Amino acid sequence: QFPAEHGWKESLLGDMEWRLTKEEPLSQITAYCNSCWDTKGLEDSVAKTFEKCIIEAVSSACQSQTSILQGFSYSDLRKFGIVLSAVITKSWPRTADNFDDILKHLLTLADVKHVFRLCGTDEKILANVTEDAKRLIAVADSVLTKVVGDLLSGTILVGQLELIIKHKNQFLDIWQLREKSLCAVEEALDWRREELLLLKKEKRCVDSLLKMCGNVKHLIQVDFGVLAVRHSQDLSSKRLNDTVTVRLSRATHYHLSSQVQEMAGKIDLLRDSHIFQLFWREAAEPLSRHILELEEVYDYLYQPSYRKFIKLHQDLKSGEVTLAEIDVI
Amino acid sequence: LKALNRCQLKHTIALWQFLSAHKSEQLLRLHKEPFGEISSRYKADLSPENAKLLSTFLNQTGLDAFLLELHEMIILKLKNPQTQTEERFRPQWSLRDTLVSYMQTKESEILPEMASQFPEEILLASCVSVWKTAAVLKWNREMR
């Protein structure tokens, strides 16, 4: 201890700081917790500067989404606790005050899965990690439990459904580890998957229907509006149960009448069909300023094309197609 | 050799007069410090009324001989820590009397305009600030 105003401490500490900030960040991190460089007294300048260099390395390496925790060999519990504290408080999103971003952070990143598995293996890991990271891990597990409860009930938003289904393995594994730390989840996941798939099938059928109608938009085609109104509503902000009834050991959205449901699939199977589109246009030619309700479509207006090309399909199957219609088509 | 080809042994005092200013002048055009050896006693700031009065003088007479002679005083008269006593060069004295006395001791032709119209409130304690203001204006007459 020289007179502490000239710089014997800061310069000599920055020297070893430069020495340490020269190897690979993961190598620095493993050196921090693989050996016994510090017997005790983690309060002096050397230990503090080593700790700050290591947490800075954590912040730099975790921002690159690298799997830091995988293949970690350790001897001292305190060093691993500090490492996990840094990893958790730096890995979280900068704006960690929202549902969607936090859920995405828990799902996508593998470091959270690794740290949760290490936390569930032993309790000394829980003892070592600081309380600042304790609050973060508590927020994470509480929001995960909330998501699980919402999914089991079926009231959870659609974007969240597709998020879990995208990473169903990660979500199921992380929930299993959390329950081990403190069944129906996979059954609920499968049921929500089926319900969302049915919702998407109905949705695809319906917008294909309006697109086929608007292929000749220069005509009487567009009447409904209300059928478009439910189309205009976003799906991500929508709730599963409000639109689609869940199954507990189906009625869709749009409250579509069973009359046009068969036409939906019929033209979904035939959306990319030049013949069908062509003579649909030619059937629309003689018709036309007309209010196009479902009933006047159903009774005569749609599927003269359908019945005509069932006749054409029988003709092609049997082989008596005249040498004029074949050219025209 | 290219620079001194057109010089004989009768301009040297004038030549040392010019170079010792010009080599300092460049230091002002790079926004660095012109004089790093002059003590801060002569590096005071002109008062706004003094600057307004000095602007008229700078716009009156040509800013070549004035700048050269002021640079001589700042480079070989105020450079030594011997004028700390008021006998040699009192910092509380004005600049007009100092300059007229200097050319009286320099046996050089003077412009009486500087002896006549120069404001007397310009003190020797604020001379570099004058010279900079005397050299800035010349700067904003060169690029044009």
Next chain:
Amino acid sequence: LTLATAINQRGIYVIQAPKGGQKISPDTVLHLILPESPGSHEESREYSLEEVKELLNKLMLMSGKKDRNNTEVERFSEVFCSVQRLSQAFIDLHSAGNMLFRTWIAMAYCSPKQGVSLQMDFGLDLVTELKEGGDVTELLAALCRQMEHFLDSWKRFVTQKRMEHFYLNFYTAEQLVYLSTELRKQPPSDAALTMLSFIKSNCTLRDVLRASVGCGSEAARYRMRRVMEELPLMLLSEFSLVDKLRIIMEQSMRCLPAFLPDCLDLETLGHCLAHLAGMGGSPVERCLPRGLQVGQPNLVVCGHSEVLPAALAVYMQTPSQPLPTYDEVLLCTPATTFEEVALLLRRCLTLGSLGHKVYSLLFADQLSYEVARQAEELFHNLCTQQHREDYQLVMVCDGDWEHCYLPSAFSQHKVFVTPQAPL
């Protein structure tokens, strides 16, 4: 392309002062004389500058199927650029006011005719016609460099002689040419008498002779004879055409009447004007108005409709002395160049002036930015050398355009009282 090849093989670029009365311009001082092919029967055509520019455009746009040995086009484009550079260097020198190039004729050969690549004739008896052989482009480059160097030297010389002889400030660089050519002549055109009538009112032939009896020094004639009998030795001393041209043109800068003897020299013209000035009469003596200080520029800022009436009052304090003229009063328009403002800022700030008059600028605000910048700078340069101490200078600017460069720059000397008088 074949025409370009013919021009490259046999091409004559003539550079001369325009024949007739047309203004000097690149389109008028440059031709291309394509000569007769050996054994052919054409007319050895002449092409103007425009018909060579259009040929260059055609050549650039007819690249063709064999763009792999484009030498006959590169050589033509290089020689054309060199010759155009020479023509511009001559045009600007002619506009500067030189005497020696007024009858110059050049002959640039795109290929050595007989060992001669460049021919240079001045049209005067003393000067020997020069001819050099080699690469035309290098010779033209060095030649134009020499003319540009002497251009700056000659402009400096004209400035010096304007500073020395004051009255060579009443006339521009071309009016000086006109006067130095006409005054020595048998009775000059009445245009010259009118031009000189501003210095000496009602100037006549006998007044010109009486002013020219002794305008020249007796050492000047001895010097011109010395150079006249010395020049061939100096020409034989140097080998390269550029060195010989340097010698001839420097001697012209020294004792110009030795080469071409029917025109006055600059100093001789100044002495003649000064002698003619004395025969004029009593100099006018006018004093600056109240609130205006002699020896300092005075800036008057006032509305447009009052700019002209604010000038009469400046001259309305000696209402028995003759009204001013193109001297002492300048009107500034967006079309006034540097010469017309310099001829006032140097007519006011010059020692060799007899009398006391007030010099005024009207509508200075409307002066062009470059012209105003050069004007203020010239004034400062004149101040830093020698000057009349009581230079009476008045600037009048429309109040609306006070933000313009010149009033803003001179605002430090702006007066607070506006000259005015009853109707």
Next chain:
Amino acid sequence: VFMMVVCIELKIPLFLVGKPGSSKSLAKTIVADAMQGPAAYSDLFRSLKQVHLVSFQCSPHSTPQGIISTFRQCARFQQGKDLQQYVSVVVLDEVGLAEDSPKMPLKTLHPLLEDGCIEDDPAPHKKVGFVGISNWALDPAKMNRGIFVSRGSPNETELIESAKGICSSDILVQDVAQGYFASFAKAYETVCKRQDKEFFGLRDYYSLIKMVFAAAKASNRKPSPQDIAQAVLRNFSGKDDIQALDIFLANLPEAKCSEEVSPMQLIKQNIFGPSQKVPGGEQEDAESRYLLVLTKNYVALQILQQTFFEGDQQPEIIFGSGFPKDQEYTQLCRNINRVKICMETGKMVLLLNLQNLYESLYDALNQYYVHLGGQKYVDLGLGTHRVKCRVHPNFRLIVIEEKDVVYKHFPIPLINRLEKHYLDINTVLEKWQKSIVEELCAWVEKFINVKAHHFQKRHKYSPSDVFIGYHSDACASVVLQVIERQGPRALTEELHQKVSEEAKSILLNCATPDAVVRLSAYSLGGFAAEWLSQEYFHRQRHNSFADFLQAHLHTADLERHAIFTEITTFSRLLTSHDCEILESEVTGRAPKPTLLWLQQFDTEYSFLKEVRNCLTNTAKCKILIFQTDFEDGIRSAQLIASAKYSVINEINKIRENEDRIFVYFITKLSRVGRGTAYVGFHGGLWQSVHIDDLRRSTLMVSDVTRLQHVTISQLFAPGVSILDTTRLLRSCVQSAVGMLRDQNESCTRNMRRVVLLLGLLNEDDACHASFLRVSKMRLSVFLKKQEESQFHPLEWLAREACNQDALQEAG
């Protein structure tokens, strides 16, 4: 087309006014080719008159004499021909661009449209047809009485109909790529036109539909995202206030799946063909609009050059003129002739010029071709000469321009005719590699002026005074150079460190050698300060230019043809004798490095001739040296930049061999200067290395780090020398006797003393050698006795280096 045909056959003035891209010009081009009397493409046009077009492009500076000259040139052709089988028509492009100009041209139109003559005697061959196609509005009174037609903009139905017309070439791929992107493209194109000022694009919507239709002409069908996304993204991508992708996406949620291709791959897909490997069939109708790259501080050129154009396929740069000659007429003619050569031979053009050349290349950029023999011809115009030139299929044009100039000083039609893209050094760097740019900009601050709590006599430095040639985006340029040299590697933890370390080492190249030891001193014996000192002096050659050249020829990669290096110095430039010394050591692998001074040349063609004669030689490894004194100003930087591309173009031209070529640019700047500031670290094939003294001096030792272990006393002690003691004590005698003063003021022995000593301070005679030896020993003893009263006698080198005032006085 119909209106121009009718009004040209009957010689009726026709004034066509509309928005840019209303295809008025397309109508003009097809009509001119088709009508051709008995040389028409069909029997319909064979019965109509042959037509010769004389096209004059109006401008705000259009003199009235120009229009009269155009009319008389048009009438000259019609003279001597039948007036019922031949006619010449004056086509005034942008006739509304010269409406209210002070030199009013359109006062000569009213007489000329009537009789064909202003005041001369009318002739039956003087009355000529007239058509005026202008993008700006027109007064319906300066026309004589001609049919004045204006269309405006297609509201909705015309847009859909034009979409179908473009997509009406297969009749089945249309249904794949219609229905949705035939009214929806309309609906968001109208929104894009509504939400923006300084109109952008009407040709940017037809081109969008063409890209969509060609994409739908893939294997079977792809009206899907990641392919519609690219087509919508090539709708103007340089506005920065109209989010083109979002506007289409905010109304269409079906295709909200995009990889977000950077504006770095949309340049490959615009230049290197539409398809990545081979388009369906042949590439005959894949004509993409010529590229216009908006950049800041002229960095797009460097970005591209480190990027795609890797050697042989490099385009030839078309620039202005930096040499103090080559007037506008003779340089624009030389810059259109080369564009024509590139069009003929199918070589890429990098148009670095400005609006000087986009008055002649106004129909080539329009891309309305005339077909003959299966080849495309488009007309170019020099002055009034307007003639068609061949375009090779492999012709791509790139314009590089500053964003502000395009936004404010580019005509709107020209902006429409070019496919816009914004490329900046911050839009090419990934997030991870952009952090080691800020890290570098902080490490520079920690490098130039070290933090010290013990020394108080400090001088604050600017980054330029230490890393000479340090502009704002210097760290970005260095990082981009390092990234391009590394390659497309996945982000390992080492790379975030290896790239940063390499960028540190490269950025250290342009640091003054005094600053390295200043760091080594102020940071007392620091580890980083010592590593950066070992690197600068013992691993990275900086002593002399001969050493640098010898180490650069012996370490450069063998798989590169031309190598470009930039050298900055505070010393004097190399002379003939210095290069003779260099050749005395480089003989065996390189010929004499020719020394060319850029400021001597007074014409671009002369410099090109000199460099060609230097290059058209028989040599394997050849060294070219270009030297420019940086006489500070905005006049020498332009000269350096103009000579920089003139060497690259000639390198690309003379390329048949694999001969290694070395190009060196030497800049002579001063430690303290005046005026502007040198901006190095240009980036690209250029690396900035600073050699303080370019000559292997015989006065002192070449490696100045040998002076860190020796005081001033050991230099004079004999018993292979760091310093030349004899020349040292012989070069101060003239000043060593200027402080002698004889006791009596009656002696002039001072002038004799120098003559005595300079004759005595030699080794020719034994007594003189003994005198030198004893004088050196006495001086050594004196300096040894004078060093006991000094702190740290050994490190006088660092003390001298810290003296900024003493550095400025020597250079």
